[PDB]
Amino acid sequence: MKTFTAKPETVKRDWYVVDATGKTLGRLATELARRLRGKHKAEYTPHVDTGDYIIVLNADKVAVTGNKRTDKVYYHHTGHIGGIKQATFEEMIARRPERVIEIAVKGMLPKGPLGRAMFRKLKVYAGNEHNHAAQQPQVLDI
Amino acid sequence: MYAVFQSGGKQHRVSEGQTVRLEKLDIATGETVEFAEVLMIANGEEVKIGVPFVDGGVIKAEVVAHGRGEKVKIVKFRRRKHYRKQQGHRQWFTDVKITGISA
Amino acid sequence: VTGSGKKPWRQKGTGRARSGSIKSPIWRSGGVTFAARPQDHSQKVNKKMYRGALKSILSELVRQDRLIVVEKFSVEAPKTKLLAQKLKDMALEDVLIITGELDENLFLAARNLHKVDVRDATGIDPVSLIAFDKVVMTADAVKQVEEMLA
Amino acid sequence: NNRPVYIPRPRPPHPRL
Amino acid sequence: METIAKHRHARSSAQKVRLVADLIRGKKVSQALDILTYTNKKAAVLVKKVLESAIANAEHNDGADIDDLKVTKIFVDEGPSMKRIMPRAKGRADRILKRTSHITVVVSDR
Amino acid sequence: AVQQNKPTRSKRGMRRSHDALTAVTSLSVDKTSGEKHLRHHITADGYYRGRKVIAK
Amino acid sequence: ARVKRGVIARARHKKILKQAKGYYGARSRVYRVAFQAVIKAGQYAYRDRRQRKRQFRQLWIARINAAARQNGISYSKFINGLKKASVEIDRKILADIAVFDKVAFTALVEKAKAALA
RNA sequence: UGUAACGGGGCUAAACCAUGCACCGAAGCUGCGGCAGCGACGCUUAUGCGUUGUUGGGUAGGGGAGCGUUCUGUAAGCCUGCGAAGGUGUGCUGUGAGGCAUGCUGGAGGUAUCAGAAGUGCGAAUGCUGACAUAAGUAACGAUAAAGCGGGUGAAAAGCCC
RNA sequence: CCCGGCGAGGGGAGUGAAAAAGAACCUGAAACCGUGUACGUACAAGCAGUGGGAGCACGCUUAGGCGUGUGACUGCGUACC
């Protein structure tokens, strides 16, 4: 018969906490994208957001191997005559340590309205504390 | 309480007392048909196929209708090459209702 | 087509399609690319082929019993009423009367009868034999047929 | 509906040789 | 009741009159009348005359009590256009369309 | 200076969305004669703030 | 024998426009544009009659892979175990079982693990 | 012009070398259902095949077989004012061009089957004629000699009369 | 007869088998322009479709779907000659 399709209304989404201390940026980010997309669930549907809410703590403690800590450069254009701005990994960490983790996940997710929707589930914090204790955020070891 | 069986080259998962549409069969509309090629039978207890097609599992089914499927329009068009072609297709199907599933 | 050969407008400079005359076939009110002319549609048929078809037609009428041979067929007076009565008792409504000799009395009687035709053996055509449901031939009319058919 | 009559030269006399 | 009333072949363009029509759509006749009275458009007096006629038709040919009447439907449709020739520079000619319209107003007590 | 493609009726309506007129919806009633008139304007018969000002 | 083509031409145009119903703008109103839209829809329909089969195949594999991993085995290992165990269930049924009957899938992965070991 | 010499994220193995076992992956191959061409044989003998093997991407182009439109005969026959043609929807039907039945408008013509003849099929030709869009309620309203007020007429007056 | 400027145009009445046969008059298609109803649309990028597809609004037997309309989201996809 017709293949099962998850209905967005009747989807259960869980809350998890991931400690991002001493974790490789890319390998941690790759796992987060998988959970946010919902590919880990047997009811995964490409056109439905079946993912789960993920809280990431200690963003500033993320680790990178090699010289990426100083050689990795993030470029962004401001849409002006010469508005090309670059920041290294240290500069990003000092300014906004959470943004680097968000940038990594941003590029590991599909582009489109559904991709933006599942990205909004991620909640990255620089410190070790979060204000989402009312969501029963069970600890996820990964 | 459902079983999996192979009928027309594609497997079907049918529960008791439900109608399933499958490829045309050389059976009149008012005769029972047998499906001894049962891939899997599921119940409160689970039984699998150590050898394919279980050991004695059979499915009793009754033919209902021998209609044709919805018309499908096939269009072949080559851009700028002065070649256009049209065609139609209606696939034959057989509606069968599962009457009994053995063990 | 009535008109003049003057070019509607100059070849170049105008922003619209090149035109040569107001009478071009792709123009309104004047044209017809291949105009018809009075022609003869008559086609040749060999004498033997005409005779063979006529012989073939006569044989099959006999086979389908659509041909009835009788003695002299005549009407005493030029009255359509008499002819209608004579054909009524014979259960014939659409008949082609073929007689060896054409008499004005029979010709006038059947003139106003659409379903009835009166003809001579010489003036016999395949279409009339096929079209008419029944054909009645007199003894004299029969004889002239073989002579002309040979 | 009706063709114009003046039909001036719309092209500009400026050859790009 | 239907009690339709229309004015056909108005000289005003359908677009221009259609702005005035949207103002009074669905409103009561009492509020519609003074809204048009103080609207500074030519279409205002064209529509107002049609609305007056519709109210009169309802009062005379149909039931009375025009106080509780509303303009249930009002629409403007493009009418026949008159083609005119207007000379332009360099001997060219262009077509001027004098656009007309039909104004239809429907009022009912329910 | 001239369009390359004719705009649709959708774009035409979208541009015209701002052309809608607005009703005055601010008709005041004269103190004495009780005649509807535009605010800060004399009545049709020639009244303003109650007292007659036109006398014609 | 002059022949007028008004009736036939109008019939053909109506047939195309009927097939172009629901398209946006002139694609559903104008015949010249509607004919192109209808033809293109025909090409896409023919092409997507084949992409549908592979698109659903990918969806079933993703569902099986998620279910198998949840049971503690990779998709590639799980399928290999079934082949070794002589199980002819295809992806469509496997994905259907995983979504609905978790116990049946648990038995399948257990059977696959035994065959591999 | 802007990272801009992995497609990107990102990777210290998610790079490279050697070996191995898995899996994904096309309209390829196989399975199931259906259609058509060609060559054989068992038999029907102007046709089905209990069958058999194989073929079926296609421009220029060659070959074969068909649909539909107007008119002629069949036809003073047949359908039709308890409703023809045309128009507009819907539902069936054929591998196709198409066909059939019917709701509403329409108001008096239409035509089976089988043959015959073509002004026999349009999306393009800066095609021709008409109708209607677009730009757009945009530019402009034709000498920068100039108007203001009172009264009159009128449904209405900056433009008419005083 | 009524609205209107002793207008235009219209609503009644009447004539007629029929007045969406009213002289702008048989039939009255398409482009084009409107009013009403259902659904969608103001954080989302491209030949505007196609495959999958939730929700909503209408009807049908059954109480599960089937049909009709719309169509969020998603894979693929750069008109014709």
Nearest CB among E19, E34, E35 relative to F20 is that of E19
Structure tokens at B84: 């256009």
Determine phi and psi for C99, rounding to 5 degrees: -125, 150
Using CB atoms within 10 Å of the CB of residue E58, give its burial: 0 to 12 exposed, 13 to 18 middle, 19+ buried: buried
Whether residue C13 and residue D3 make contact (CB cut-off 8 A), yes or no, is no
Nucleotide H87 C1' to residue B7 CA (A): 51
Question: Cα angle vertex G100, ends G77, A110, to 5°?
Answer: 65
- Report yes or no: E23 and F19 within 8 Å, Cβ to Cβ: no
Structure tokens at E24: 């009074």
Determine phi and psi for E23, rounding to 5 degrees: -65, -40
How distant is the Cα of D6 from the closest Cα of chain E, in angstroms? 6
- What are the CA-CA distances from residue F27 to residues A20, F49, F51, G100 (Å)? 68, 14, 18, 69
Is residue G72 left, alpha or beta, with left meaning phi > 0 and alpha meaning psi from -120 to 50?
left
How distant is the Cα of A31 from the closest Cα of chain G, in angstroms? 14
Maximum distance among all Cα pairs of chain F, rounded to whole angstroms: 63
| Sheet containing C134-138: order of strands | C67-70, C134-138, C95-99, C116-120
Nearest CB among G56, G92, G98 relative to A42 is that of G98
3-state SS class at B52:
coil
Q: Label the pairing between strands B59-65 and B93-101.
A: antiparallel
3-state SS class at A6:
coil
Structure tokens at A118: 């599942």
Q: Within its chain, how far is the Cα of E20 from the centroid?
A: 8
**Cβ within 8 Å of residue G103, ≥6 positions away:** B46
User: What DSSP state is assigned to residue A24?
Assistant: B
SS3 helix, strand, coil % of chain E, rounded to 5? 40, 40, 20
Is chain A in touch with chain G: ≥3 Cβ pairs within 8 A? yes
In the block, which residue shows the tokens 């052309």?
Answer: F19
Between 1.10.3720.10, 3.90.10.10, 3.40.50.20, 3.40.1370.10, what CATH number should domain C1-149 receive? 3.40.1370.10
Cα–Cα distance for residue pair B20/B81, rounded to 1 Å: 44
- Report yes or no: B12 and B20 within 8 Å, Cβ to Cβ: yes
Cα–Cα distance for residue pair C132/C92, rounded to 1 Å: 11
Rounded to 10 degrees, the C-alpha dihedral C125/C128/C131/C134 comes to -120
Residue of A nearest to G60 (CA): A3
Using CB atoms within 10 Å of the CB of residue B35, give its burial: 0 to 12 exposed, 13 to 18 middle, 19+ buried: buried
Q: Label the pairing between strands F27-29 and F36-38.
A: antiparallel
| Three-state SS sequence of chain G | CCCCCHHHHHHHHHHHHHHCCCCCHHHHCCHHHHHHHHHHHHHHHHHHHHHHHHHHHHHHHHHHHHHHHHHCCCHHHHHHHHHHCCCCCCHHHHHHHHHHCHHHHHHHHHHHHHHHC
* Statement: the CB of G29 is under 7 Å from strand I: yes
- What are the CA-CA distances from residue E20 to residues A78, D9, E25, E45, E49 (Å)? 47, 46, 9, 10, 13
In the block, which residue shows the tokens 């997710």?
Answer: A109
Helix C47-63, helix C139-149: angle, nearest 10: 140
Q: Which nucleotides of I are covered by protein (CB under 7 A)?
A: 1-4, 7-12, 24, 29-36, 43-45, 47-55, 69-76, 79-81
Cα–Cα distance for residue pair A81/A78, rounded to 1 Å: 9
In the block, which residue shows the tokens 């609905």?
Answer: G100
Structure tokens at C95: 């008949």
Q: Write down the domain spans for chain C.
A: 1-149
Question: Cα angle vertex C107, ends C103, C109, to 5°?
Answer: 120
- One-letter amino acid of B14: V
Does the annotation place E90 within a ligand binding site?
Answer: yes
Q: Exposure pattern of E60-81 as b/e (b: 16+ CB <10 Å)?
A: eeeeeebeebbbeebebeebee
Q: Exposure pattern of A32-49 as b/e (b: 16+ CB <10 Å)?
A: bbebbbbbbbbbbbeeeb
Helix (H) or strand (E) holding D16: none
In the block, which residue shows the tokens 């535009």?
Answer: F38
Cα–Cα distance for residue pair C138/C126, rounded to 1 Å: 18
Closest residue by Cα to residue E75 from E44, E106, E98: E106
Nearest CB among G49, G89, G103 relative to B11 is that of G89
Cα–Cα distance for residue pair E20/E25, rounded to 1 Å: 9
Closest residue by Cα to residue E106 from E70, E76, E79: E70
Q: Which residues of E touch D8 (CB under 8 A)?
A: 90-91
Cα–Cα distance for residue pair E67/E50, rounded to 1 Å: 17
- What are the CA-CA distances from residue E91 to residues D2, D6, E85, E87, E94 (Å)? 14, 6, 12, 7, 10
Query: Which residues 30-49 of G interface with strand I at a CB distance below 7 A?
Result: 30, 36-37, 39-41, 44-45, 47-49
CB atoms within 10 A of CB B1: 10
Whether residue C13 and residue D10 make contact (CB cut-off 8 A), yes or no, is yes
- One-letter amino acid of E82: M
Whether residue D9 and residue C15 make contact (CB cut-off 8 A), yes or no, is no
- Whether B27 contacts chain G with CB within 8 A: no
What is the count of structural domains for chain G?
A: 1
Structure tokens at C16: 């619209």
Is residue C91 left, alpha or beta, with left meaning phi > 0 and alpha meaning psi from -120 to 50?
left
CB atoms within 10 A of CB G95: 25
Whether residue E90 and residue D6 make contact (CB cut-off 8 A), yes or no, is yes
CB atoms within 10 A of CB E24: 23
CB atoms within 10 A of CB A52: 20
Structure tokens at B21: 């549409």
Domains and CATH numbers, chain E: 1-110 (3.90.470.10)
Q: Label the pairing between strands A15-19 and A53-57.
A: parallel
- What are the CA-CA distances from residue D10 to residues C12, C13, C14, D1 (Å)? 11, 7, 9, 20
Q: Which residues of B touch G15 (CB under 8 A)?
A: none
Q: Label the pairing between strands A53-57 and A123-124.
A: parallel
Is chain C in touch with chain F: ≥3 Cβ pairs within 8 A? no
- Report yes or no: C134 and C64 within 8 Å, Cβ to Cβ: no
DSSP string, C61-93: HHHTT-EEEES----SSS-HHHHHHHHHTTT-S
The CA R_g of chain A, rounded to the nearest whole Å, is 17
DSSP string, B5-35: EESSSSEEEEETT-EEEEE--S--TTSEEEE
Cα–Cα distance for residue pair C138/C96, rounded to 1 Å: 11
Nucleotide H99 C1' to residue B28 CA (A): 30
Whether residue D4 and residue E90 make contact (CB cut-off 8 A), yes or no, is no
Which technique was used to obtain these atomic coordinates? cryo-EM
Q: Label the pairing between strands A15-19 and F36-38.
A: unpaired
Cα–Cα distance for residue pair B46/G109, rounded to 1 Å: 13
Closest residue by Cα to residue B89 from B72, B76, B75: B72
Structure tokens at A16: 């998890």
Cα–Cα distance for residue pair G89/B49, rounded to 1 Å: 10
E strands in chain F: 27-29, 36-38, 47-48, 51-52
Closest residue by Cα to residue C126 from C73, C50, C21, C68: C50
In the block, which residue shows the tokens 């029509």?
Answer: E21
Residue of F nearest to E32 (CA): F23
**Cβ within 8 Å of residue A45, ≥6 positions away:** A5, A6, A38, G59
Query: Which residues 68-127 of A interface with strand I at a CB distance below 7 A?
Result: 110, 112-117
Cα–Cα distance for residue pair F56/F43, rounded to 1 Å: 12
Q: Which residues of G touch A (CB under 8 A)?
A: 56, 59-60, 62-63, 66-67, 69-70, 92, 95-96, 98-100
Structure tokens at A82: 């010469």
Q: Which residues of E touch D (CB under 8 A)?
A: 90-93, 95
Nearest CB among G43, G89, G103 relative to B4 is that of G89
Structure tokens at A57: 């703590």
Task: Identify the chains in contact with D, defined as 3+ C-beta pairs within 8 A.
Answer: C, E
3-state SS class at A66:
coil
Q: Which residues of A touch G91 (CB under 8 A)?
A: none
- One-letter amino acid of A52: D
Closest residue by Cα to residue B23 from B99, B92, B98: B92
Instruction: Select from G38, G50, G89, G108 the residue whose CB has the most chain B CBs within 10 Å, as the one to mutate to test that interface.
Output: G89
Cα–Cα distance for residue pair C81/C110, rounded to 1 Å: 10
Q: Which residues of E touch D7 (CB under 8 A)?
A: none
Is chain B in touch with chain G: ≥3 Cβ pairs within 8 A? yes
Residues in chain B: 103
- What are the CA-CA distances from residue A79 to residues A83, B35, E36, E72, G74 (Å)? 6, 67, 51, 53, 45
- Give the resolution in Å: 2.4
Nucleotide I21 C1' to residue E56 CA (A): 28
Q: Which nucleotide is the nearest neighbour of E51, by CA and C1'?
A: I3
- What are the CA-CA distances from residue E2 to residues E5, E16, E69, E103 (Å)? 9, 26, 11, 16
Rounded to 10 degrees, the C-alpha dihedral C93/C99/C103/C106 comes to -10
Q: Which residues of A touch G66 (CB under 8 A)?
A: 39-42, 44
CB atoms within 10 A of CB G109: 21
- One-letter amino acid of G48: D
Q: Which nucleotide is the nearest neighbour of C8, by CA and C1'?
A: H128
Cα–Cα distance for residue pair C72/E7, rounded to 1 Å: 85
Whether residue G45 and residue B42 make contact (CB cut-off 8 A), yes or no, is no
Helix G102-116, helix G75-84: angle, nearest 10: 70
Cα–Cα distance for residue pair G40/G53, rounded to 1 Å: 21
Using CB atoms within 10 Å of the CB of residue B60, give its burial: 0 to 12 exposed, 13 to 18 middle, 19+ buried: middle
Interrupted after residues, chain E (C–N over 2.5 Å): none
User: What DSSP state is assigned to residue E70?
Assistant: E
Determine phi and psi for F25, rounding to 5 degrees: 45, 30
Structure tokens at C73: 């067929």
Determine phi and psi for E97, rounding to 5 degrees: -100, 115
In the block, which residue shows the tokens 């490829």?
Answer: B23
E strands in A32-92: 53-57, 73-77, 84-88
Helices (H), E39-91: 42-61
Q: Which residues of D touch E95 (CB under 8 A)?
A: 1
- What are the CA-CA distances from residue C141 to residues B89, C77, C100, E24 (Å)? 64, 21, 4, 95
Using CB atoms within 10 Å of the CB of residue C146, give its burial: 0 to 12 exposed, 13 to 18 middle, 19+ buried: exposed
Q: Which nucleotides of H are covered by protein (CB under 7 A)?
A: 1-4, 8-14, 22-27, 31-34, 58-60, 68-71, 73-74, 76, 86-90, 93-99, 117-123, 125-137, 142, 151
Q: How far apart are the first and last CA of chain B?
A: 10
Cα–Cα distance for residue pair E86/C118, rounded to 1 Å: 77
Structure tokens at A80: 């002006």
Helix (H) or strand (E) holding A108: none
Cα–Cα distance for residue pair C61/C69, rounded to 1 Å: 12
DSSP string, C11-43: SSS-SS-----TT-TTSSSS--TT---------
**Cβ within 8 Å of residue B72, ≥6 positions away:** B88, B89, B90, B91, G45, G49
Question: Cα angle vertex G114, ends G112, G117, to 5°?
Answer: 110
* Statement: the CB of E56 is under 7 Å from strand I: yes
Q: Label the pairing between strands C95-99 and C67-70.
A: unpaired
Q: How far apart are the first and last CA of chain E?
A: 8
- What are the CA-CA distances from residue A114 to residues A101, A121, G51 (Å)? 20, 12, 22
- What are the CA-CA distances from residue F54 to residues E37, F19, F48 (Å)? 21, 37, 9
